[PDB]
């Protein structure tokens, strides 16, 4: 339970993985060469971390255990040009000459299943090299159907392979307003059922919310995909803060599994991070921890295009960085309960988990961040997720009415039966989620 | 057995041998006066193979030149490489055979065969490591097709163990000036099938086509064709002479390149064949030569892959080439040309590589195949014979010669038997 | 009795022996010229070698006792151009005046024994010069029929001469897809006949697998025969290191011979060596010997076109070179017992002939594999070679039915009964391996 395997699938997934590895290097002060980087600490690695993501070698050079898979050679060449490839092993990465399809047709097809055995034996060899395992981390965008199908195939193969560690999947969601890809809703809906069958826990993040945040909080005129990558890297690092750096209240992955799954089928947590702001305003403004807890409930920090007030509260967790006073956060959570911002349920209500980590948050130079000694990462289970599901499903059905494209999918690897089945599965999931949220 | 003898006869085979020696002295680099210029050790060995260590470090190539006209030896003496020669290396008689195979090997051939056989026996006594006997003559001309045939017969009778490399030139069907040409050709091959064991199909019309498509020459000139055939003949002997990853010998081909001893004909192909001036655009690669070898337009036999069924194939290369590339090319061509590639082998391949780079090239390749298109040329020459001696025109000449038509029918029936062997093995 | 005599037959065998002597001189710090250079230098004397293979002259010169026999004068000139000819004695190398045939039909004929008489009196004189002998070493190829024929005939003659010393014959096996000589099936069958006459131990190796390894593991675009010869030199050096250098587990060659043959008849064990990787990849990896063992069990590190995962397990030997930890080999045998992939025979099951050599492995600079401080060589018996022999026998039977080259053979001095008996012997060996696999 000391190692976590991270997988980078698709173009956006590979970029996010690159950003997370760069941020992990920056937190521990790791340079492209390293050898640890360098050997003086304790707790920059060793000891753990790095012992959860970076593989320890006989020479001491920490190899970040990452598997970059994509059938687009340009992205693979790009990620090979950087020093990250030197950090990784040349055999860990997988290359493809011709992209699967646009986008989910071949990504889930048997052509995408041909490399399944290759990557499976790669993962088996990597596990044989290391010692112990806590879970499987996944990084693929639900917008990219290629990455979606490939990640679902890997998740199914890992569930059929080990089934002993919690399968984590970080999914990127497109903007509900505009969609550049016309089959993007089809790919996402078809992938939802696969992730329901395979994933033990999910992560839903919206690009449009990230862009609104960086335009508003960081006060930037021009958003960039690199800024989104940096923000998601900060998020992912905030998730595994206790596993990398020791804190006053070290939290476990199994604790996340217990808190986020209080029912037979509840594995959809929403992410919120605060305080996030421009570094200049961070130098100008100094808020309290209660203000940060309140901003955690704002619609912007939730990284979703849904209002959290209509959502119904469920079991949530809050990770804290740097120095954090227990009595202060107790007072803050009591004040929050007194506010009754999000409507509470009858099962969970006393469901605010608190975890503290000594590692203070780090601000990347590319993307601004509120420079503060203590950060707050809230993983909630509000019922706005059902709202996003219905929002995308309405457009999915409006399309599938005429669907304008079904010939390609039914000829390549699919059929209208599979589309109808995925639609019914999404509808049943929405109905069950609304039911479990409304019975309180 | 690295030493190999060369014999040159006929009206055109003399120029063929001249160009062969030109290419020989150009490969390693040598002066036309017998002055050694190669470096360092191998070139002396190839000299001992082909030349003779005369006085003062001189070198004279071992060649037997014979023809009914001394103008031919005068002309080849006029050339730089080959100007000097021991008078015993060449004996020339008078005067002409009248383009007749029977008269050629009966009267014009018998009066000098004694002297030339004595000469070649002397040189065989001098050359201890003799293995093969390259032959340069013309099958079209009755003079050459008779004289060279008689000489090959006498050598087979004398040296049954030594190899016989026959690079004769098949007649062109377009030429209709002398109708006795294909008749003399078929009468010569009817005996050379038993006299010679290694023969190579060479059509004058194929040479004309290849120099008009690649060299784009206005009028066919024997010079460039002789240069090409000399390059091809020098490649197959340098495959063994010059060091390589795999050398090829005449015995190796006699045991591998041919399944049954009744077959002695070997198609020809050369690469690279670049047009004049386009050498800058061309880049020497394996796939382009592989494509060139399996095209009838690049062959000089010239047999059609699409027409004739392949019994066996062989591709020799020079310069730096990788075994993996040629293996992949052979697998691809076996997968795509499985129709011509016969099933009883089932995979026909014979490879040889020469390490050193070719003279003036980075890599050069030759190709040989045994296809069912040679029997088509046999049928053509038989139909020519029949339609020509059905008119009984000019047959009075051969009645005066003394030959019988029963022998002619026997020759044609043996050619039809060889065709049927190439139909066993059906096309 | 400690001395070992090596024989170099055929073009490929002579090249392999050249590479072997090159690596030998490179390991003991000896230049390819002689006198010395240098030593007999800590511990290049006792324990031998270099006095087992390198007979020491009165002046300290170490001459390798090798006989390069080949009827091709080109190979003799090639081996004379090298400085090892100056290191060798002119009487050690045997020049071939004329090649017997193309390539085996006359090599194994009377023309072979004409020169075999000379080489046998030369071997007798050499044995009179250097007393003691541990085993006869042979290097030839099946592609070069002259090499195979002369080596088989000389092996039979020397086994009839002494028969008390072991015989180790290295034979290069052709790939089943490419046939540089259409004569090679007949030659291989008639060589299997001669092995049935006398075979103490024979090593099967395919150039196809080695070239694939150079393309993949060594990242070579076009693998050269020199790299293959270098890899063969490396594997044979690892084999002979148990007798060359000191080690906690030093195993006699006759001990290997008897361990490989528990049954009344076993002649053909397959080999495998690890690690074989790129230089940069060797700098990127610092694995222990356990991963090297796990990789050697795979069909990739076999250097032959045979899958050990397919065939059943039999008595095998694991040699290790360099720094070895008992805990490492215990963990390795634990993981092997945990694998449970290949079927174990009833007599062997817990059988792994463990050998240890303190001398670290050494690789040539021309080879793309970086020199490693640790190496594992697995030599096992498998029934996949029976399948390869069956394919070769199918091809040879097709050719025999077509009887095209049987005419040239009976012209060379062969008989129908000879080929019939060779086919019967091959079928008998295949059925024998089938049965000893079925007895498991």
UniProtKB/Swiss-Prot annotation, chains A, C:
Write down the superkingdom of origin: Eukaryota
Q: Which cofactor does it need?
A: Mg(2+)
Q: Which CDD domains match?
A: alpha_tubulin
Reactions catalysed, semicolon-separated, are: GTP + H2O = GDP + phosphate + H(+)
Q: Where in the cell is it found?
A: Cytoplasm, Cytoskeleton
Q: Which GO terms describe its biological process?
A: homologous chromosome segregation; microtubule cytoskeleton organization; mitotic cell cycle; mitotic sister chromatid segregation; nuclear division; nuclear migration along microtubule; nuclear migration by microtubule mediated pushing forces
Chain residues that bind Mg(2+): 72
Swapping residue 255 to A leads to an effect described as: Poisonous alpha-tubulins that cause lethality. Microtubules do not depolymerize
InterPro entries, alphabetized: Alpha_tubulin, Tub_FtsZ_C, Tubulin, Tubulin/FtsZ-like_C, Tubulin/FtsZ_2-layer-sand-dom, Tubulin/FtsZ_GTPase_sf, Tubulin_C, Tubulin_CS
Kindly list the positions annotated as binding GTP.
Answer: 11, 72, 141, 145-146, 180, 207, 229
**Main EC class the enzyme belongs to:** hydrolase
- One Pfam family, short name please? Tubulin
The cross-references to SMART domains, in alphabetical order and at most eight, read: Tubulin, Tubulin_C
**Which residues are annotated as active site?**
255
| Entry EC no(s) | 3.6.5.-
Q: Subunit details for this protein?
A: Dimer of alpha and beta chains. A typical microtubule is a hollow water-filled tube with an outer diameter of 25 nm and an inner diameter of 15 nM. Alpha-beta heterodimers associate head-to-tail to form protofilaments running lengthwise along the microtubule wall with the beta-tubulin subunit facing the microtubule plus end conferring a structural polarity. Microtubules usually have 13 protofilaments but different protofilament numbers can be found in some organisms and specialized cells.
Annotated function: Tubulin is the major constituent of microtubules, a cylinder consisting of laterally associated linear protofilaments composed of alpha- and beta-tubulin heterodimers. Microtubules grow by the addition of GTP-tubulin dimers to the microtubule end, where a stabilizing cap forms. Below the cap, tubulin dimers are in GDP-bound state, owing to GTPase activity of alpha-tubulin.
Q: What else is known?
A: Present with 5590 molecules/cell in log phase SD medium.
Which protein are we looking at?
Answer: Tubulin alpha-1 chain
Native source organism of the sequence: Saccharomyces cerevisiae (strain ATCC 204508 / S288c) (Baker's yeast)
- The encoding gene is TUB1
């Amino acid at each position: 339970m000391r190692e976590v395997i991270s997988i980078n699938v698709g173009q956006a997934g590979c970029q996010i993985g690159n950003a997370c590895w760069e941020l992990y290097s920056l937190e521990h002060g790791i340079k492209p060469d390293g050898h640890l980087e360098d050997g003086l600490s304790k707790p920059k690695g060793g000891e753990e971390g790095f012992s959860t993501f970076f593989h320890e070698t006989g020479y001491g050079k920490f190899v970040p255990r990452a598997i970059y898979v994509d059938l687009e050679p340009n992205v693979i060449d790009e990620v090979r040009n950087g020093p990250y490839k030197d950090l990784f092993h040349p055999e860990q990465l997988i290359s493809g000459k011709e992209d699967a399809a646009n986008n989910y047709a071949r990504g889930h097809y048997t052509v995408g299943r041909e490399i399944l055995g290759d990557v499976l034996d790669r993962i088996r060899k990597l596990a044989d090299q290391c010692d112990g395992l806590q879970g499987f981390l996944f990084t693929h965008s639900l917008g990219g159907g290629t990455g979606s199908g490939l990640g679902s195939l890997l998740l199914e193969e890992l569930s059929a392979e080990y089934g002993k560690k919690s399968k984590l999947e970080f999914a990127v969601y497109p903007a509900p307003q505009v969609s550049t890809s016309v089959v993007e809703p089809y790919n996402t809906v078809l992938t939802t059922h696969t992730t329901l069958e395979h994933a033990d826990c999910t992560f839903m993040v919206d690009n449009e919310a990230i862009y609104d945040m960086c335009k508003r909080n960081l006060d930037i005129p021009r958003p960039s995909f690199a800024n989104l990558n940096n923000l998601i890297a900060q998020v992912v690092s905030s998730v595994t803060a206790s596993l990398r750096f020791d804190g006053s209240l070290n939290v476990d992955l199994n604790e996340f599994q217990t808190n986020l799954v209080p029912y037979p089928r509840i594995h959809f947590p929403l992410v919120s991070y605060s305080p996030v702001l421009s570094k200049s305003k961070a130098f100008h403004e100094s808020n309290s921890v209660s203000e940060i807890t309140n901003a955690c409930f704002e619609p912007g920090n939730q990284m979703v295009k849904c209002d959290p007030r209509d959502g119904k509260y469920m079991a949530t967790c809050l990770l804290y960085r740097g120095d954090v006073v227990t009595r202060d956060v107790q007072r803050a959570v009591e004040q929050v309960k007194n506010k009754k911002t999000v409507q509470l349920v009858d099962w969970c209500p006393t469901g605010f988990k608190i975890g503290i980590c000594y590692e203070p948050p780090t601000a990347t130079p590319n993307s601004q961040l509120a420079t503060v000694d203590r950060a707050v990462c809230m993983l909630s289970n509000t019922t706005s997720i059902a709202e996003a599901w219905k929002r995308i499903d309405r457009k999915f059905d409006l399309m599938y009415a005429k669907r304008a494209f079904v010939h390609w999918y039914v000829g390549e690897g699919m059929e209208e039966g599979e589309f109808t089945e995925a639609r019914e599965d999404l509808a049943a999931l929405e109905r069950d989620y609304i039911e479990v949220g409304a019975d309180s | 057995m690295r030493e190999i003898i060369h014999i040159s006869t006929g009206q055109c085979g003399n120029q063929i041998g001249a160009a062969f020696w030109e290419t020989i002295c150009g490969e390693h680099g040598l002066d036309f006066n017998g002055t050694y210029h190669g470096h360092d050790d191998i070139q002396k060995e190839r000299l001992n193979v082909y030349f003779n260590e005369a006085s003062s470090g001189k070198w004279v190539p071992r060649s037997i030149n014979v023809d009914l006209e001394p103008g031919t030896i005068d002309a080849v003496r006029n050339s730089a490489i080959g100007n000097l020669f021991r008078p015993d290396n060449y004996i020339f008689g008078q005067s002409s055979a009248g383009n007749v195979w029977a008269k050629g090997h009966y009267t014009e051939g018998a009066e000098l065969v004694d002297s030339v056989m004595d000469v070649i026996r002397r040189e065989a006594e001098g050359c201890d490591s003799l293995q093969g006997f390259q032959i340069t003559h013309s099958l079209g001309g009755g003079t050459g097709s008779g004289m060279g045939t008689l000489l090959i017969s006498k050598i087979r009778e004398e040296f049954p163990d030594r190899m016989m490399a026959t690079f004769s030139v098949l007649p062109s069907p377009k030429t209709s000036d002398t109708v006795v040409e294909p008749y003399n050709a078929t009468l010569s091959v009817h005996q050379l099938v038993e006299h010679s064991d290694e023969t190579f199909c060479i059509d004058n019309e194929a040479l004309y086509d290849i120099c008009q498509r690649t060299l784009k020459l206005n009028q066919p000139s024997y010079g460039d064709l002789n240069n090409l055939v000399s390059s091809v003949m020098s490649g197959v002997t340098t495959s063994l002479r010059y060091p390589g990853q795999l050398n090829s010998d005449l015995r190796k081909l006699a045991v591998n390149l041919v399944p049954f001893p009744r077959l002695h004909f070997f198609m020809v192909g050369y690469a690279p064949l670049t047009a004049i001036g386009s050498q800058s655009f061309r880049s020497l690669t394996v796939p382009e030569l592989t494509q060139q070898m399996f095209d009838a337009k690049n062959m000089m036999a010239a047999a059609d892959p699409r027409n004739g069924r392949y019994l066996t194939v062989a591709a020799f290369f020079r310069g730096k080439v990788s075994v993996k590339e040629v293996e992949d090319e052979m697998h691809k061509v076996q997968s795509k040309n499985s129709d011509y590639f016969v099933e009883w082998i089932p995979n026909n391949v014979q490879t040889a590589v020469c390490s050193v780079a070719p003279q003036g090239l980075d890599m050069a390749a030759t190709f040989i195949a045994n296809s069912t298109s040679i029997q088509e040329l046999f049928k053509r020459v038989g139909d020519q014979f029949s339609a020509m001696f059905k008119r009984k025109a000019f047959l009075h000449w051969y009645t005066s010669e003394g030959m019988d038509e029963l022998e002619f029918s026997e020759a044609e029936s043996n050619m039809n038997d060889l065709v049927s062997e190439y139909q066993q093995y059906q096309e």
